[PDB]
Amino acid sequence: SMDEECVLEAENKKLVEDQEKLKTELRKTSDALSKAQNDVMEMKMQSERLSKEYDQLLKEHSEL
Amino acid sequence: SMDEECVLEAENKKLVEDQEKLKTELRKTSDALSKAQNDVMEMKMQSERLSKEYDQLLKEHSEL
């Protein structure tokens, strides 16, 4: 009936609105996860580089 | 019409099901982010600690 349809329509508008909010939130959370995963990666290869230069410093002083 | 009603109904079902997919997906991502944020703090304190003894090691050798 026309009334049932108008209820379904109203419900569908609300669900689409909620889906937009949910997608937005998923998108932010997901970006944040990505950035954090890069930061952990960038700090590791940074840290490795640093340790190599550390050991090298020790050597510069162990071999004169 | 009854055709329209049946389409709206099908769409309503799909939207409710997708809403659950999105909620779970969000909950998982949020948990993963939580873990990665902890790893960032871990990574940080390691890298900074390393960097500090490196700067100290450099300072000890520097005066001309």
From Swiss-Prot, chains A, B:
Residue ranges that the Swiss-Prot or TrEMBL entry lists as coiled coil: 3-64
Region Disordered: start-end pairs: 33-58
Biased composition annotated in UniProt, kind: Basic and acidic residues: 41-58
Subcellular location(s) per record: Endoplasmic reticulum membrane
Complexes and interactors: Homodimer. Heterodimer with BCAP31. Binds CASP8 (isoform 9) as a complex containing BCAP31, BCAP29, BCL2 and/or BCL2L1. Interacts with VAMP3, VAMP1 and membrane IgD immunoglobulins. May interact with ACTG1 and non-muscle myosin II.
Entry's family note: Belongs to the BCAP29/BCAP31 family.
Protein purpose: May play a role in anterograde transport of membrane proteins from the endoplasmic reticulum to the Golgi. May be involved in CASP8-mediated apoptosis.
Protein name, per record: B-cell receptor-associated protein 29
Organism in which the protein naturally occurs: Homo sapiens (Human)
Entire protein: shown range: 168 to 229 of 241
